[model samples]
Target: SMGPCDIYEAGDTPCVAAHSTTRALYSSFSGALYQLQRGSDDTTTTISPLTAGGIADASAQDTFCANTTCLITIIYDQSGNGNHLTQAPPGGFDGPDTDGYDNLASAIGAPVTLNGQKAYGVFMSPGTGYRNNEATGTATGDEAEGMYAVLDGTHYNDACCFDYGNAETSSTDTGAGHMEAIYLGNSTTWGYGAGDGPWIMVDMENNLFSGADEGYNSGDPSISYRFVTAAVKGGADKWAIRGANAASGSLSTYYSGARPDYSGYNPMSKEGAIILGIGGDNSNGAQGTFYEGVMTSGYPSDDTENSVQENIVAAKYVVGSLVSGPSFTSGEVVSLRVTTPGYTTRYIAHTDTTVNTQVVDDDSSTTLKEEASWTVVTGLANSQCFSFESVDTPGSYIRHYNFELLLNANDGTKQFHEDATFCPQAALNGEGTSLRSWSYPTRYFRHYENVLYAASNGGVQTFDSKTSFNNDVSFEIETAFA
Candidate 1:
């Protein structure tokens, strides 16, 4: 009944730092899992993992964050090494915050279930990041160590790097081998793996290596399950990468061989710092989800890692949907308003054939109201879903073409039916609800620059930028515009 860290300890590769918001990583370790700050009044609270190494006390978070937005400000270290991660300070990349610090993740940005209980994971957007520049007990200077992260495989971008592991203490790129972190993204800038990635690679400072050398490595393959287990270990002359479906199955060693024959890699110079959601130099242009991860003092054996994987599976991590909101009744007329702050005053409206967001004043004209109002009907393609019919245009419906949302006449074609239908799910930001495209399951109806489009999380498609994507897709089902 021991936890993953306990198993690592049993194998003499004691964890130097352990972090998770979903559960405790070590058996008998009970402490604050993470801290959040309410946006309403800047009030802060800390949530703890349950006693005897159980799931996070998410009910406490629910109570503290009720009816308001919350930002995760700190993630405590379970290994008792005082290596807690906070919002990263500015480094190589200029951040959006004052003095260039990175933004904190919304507390409920990535919700999931563990053993049937609700929990949350750290969702990293382009400007969100966390780091611990002065960590203790971590390996450095060609020191052998092992680490692993449970990541959301479907939510990744090809931007710079979305990494979690040991890094440079200065928050700057010190050179090759100055950092070693688990990288999960499709960025083939330095190296690439098999298939269209979202592959598991190692960010060893200057280069993200897929195998023993840079560039393509045939052994490495994409791992795109909902939940993924990515592992990496490095010593003086060798390194290895492993991955598996976190829900089930054993690990697959993607690459296990000598270190790259590149400059400054032979004798590694790791700086013992820890970073999450950004590269060592603070390249913050990547997006991904992080559940739990840890760094060990020594390189763990395969058997130890396998045992750790089994413990992860036994946790029964469930990819649950967002909490359901009020349902949309058939024939209900409504004005969909973007739920995120600064945009709440805007409602979905149409200009000619283009669907867009416009500020709708309470005293707006009837023409404006009619353009924004829509009649909800049973899904054109699936009865369980819903479709929007423009009130002003009568027979015209809101549909997607070339990914852009448009108000067009119902042509009675199967493609039009699918294009006009959307399945409502709990909002990505935990408020209101988001509309998922019926034809493109991975895409959601979101507004970017006032225009509406069906966009994927981090896809290369138009209007698919990862920044504020969750908030952009979420809409408050409000009273009719008229």
Candidate 2:
């Protein structure tokens, strides 16, 4: 039986805390609390300030300037290995390190909020990404190691692996040997299915093994979000690839097997630099978002790797969710038809930025009077679950003009719920869910006097999937992305 624990001001401890190990490197974009061990491994921590230089505390702002400059940037290896990855800025290696060798010659850093915490993410676009420019380390290279990453976006080519590395200094891992983690898409077909993937890419000798769930929408941020991991132990050529929703309680999948040749690669002997967000400089070049990441010096025990994955999942970023009912799509056209006593009003938008209601002959009519339809706009604030836009006017959104809903172009802040956001509710007629004013939860969006009105009480708040009147509250999202 589970028992209640104590309440110590010092906070209780877990058995794992007693284990002896080196922090290597730890970084949490938000602050130190998430930084498990020593702290961030930024340059400022080691040699910057010229005076108080030391390993960066969790508060250290990551390096790699967003400014326009030829100097390739550096992302310090939080893992004490001093195997920092370089950003090969553009025109080859930046600055004077032109030896054409550096973990990454040019990479840029930008602010991206992950798991609600503001953190910097590395962006590697076409022809850009980083490589390990140095052989900096004490360890001979490999035996066993595990890596993890929080990523967004799909690959650009047939085969693309965002985070990968090889012992060879050259671009191609001929005899140098390598270990890479890849996310495959473009419906190439793998473990899960076509249009479904995000698997592990071991050495070139092996195919992508240990596949995970299949499918991710292109350009859908939150739904495409993931925390993937891959581990390799050379002792017995043990390897596994696993992936899960970056957020808590999401499904997870993996495949584990032994690779007889894994030990033959001997990635340790060459002392390779880990690459970030890019594949071999071929058509499969990568352009994706990468949050914090790690590459341990040795193969961490299963317990350690799992603990790390949990920390990441527990802290995964949350954007939004379905309160109740089926998931809806963003950027989809929906019709909110309101039927009452005798008249039925259909919501429509125009180029003039006006939203007006027209009365149709009946609730089962498929004829759309004037405009295209309404689209469910996502990525709004908390109080504002979703927004609406006019399909005819395209960019124009439906907002309130003096308590009356109308189509108007948004300029950001106009009014909270009045301008954007609506609480989606389960349809009372069983057609699914309907939209309600986020602020006026008690008020139903119904037809009144042939205009958009928030009724204090009535059935106007419901709608059907195909813009049909009371025939049914039928609206469905064609695409879903938070």
Among all candidates shown, the one with the greatest lDDT: 1
TM-score of each: 0.78, 0.45
Best-performing candidate as measured by TM-score: 1
Instruction: List candidate 2 segments past 4 Å from native.
Output: 1-72, 88-111, 138-142, 153-157, 175-177, 180-195, 203-207, 210-235, 250-253, 260-271, 280-284, 319-482
Local lDDT at 470 for model 1: 77
lDDT of 2 by residue, 339-370 (tens): 33334333333335445555433343333433
Candidate lDDT scores, in order, read 0.87, 0.38
lDDT of candidate model 1 versus the reference: 0.87
Candidate 1 is scored at a TM of: 0.78
lDDT (10s digit) by residue, model 1, range 36-69: 8874466899989867698898999988966445
TM-score of 2: 0.45
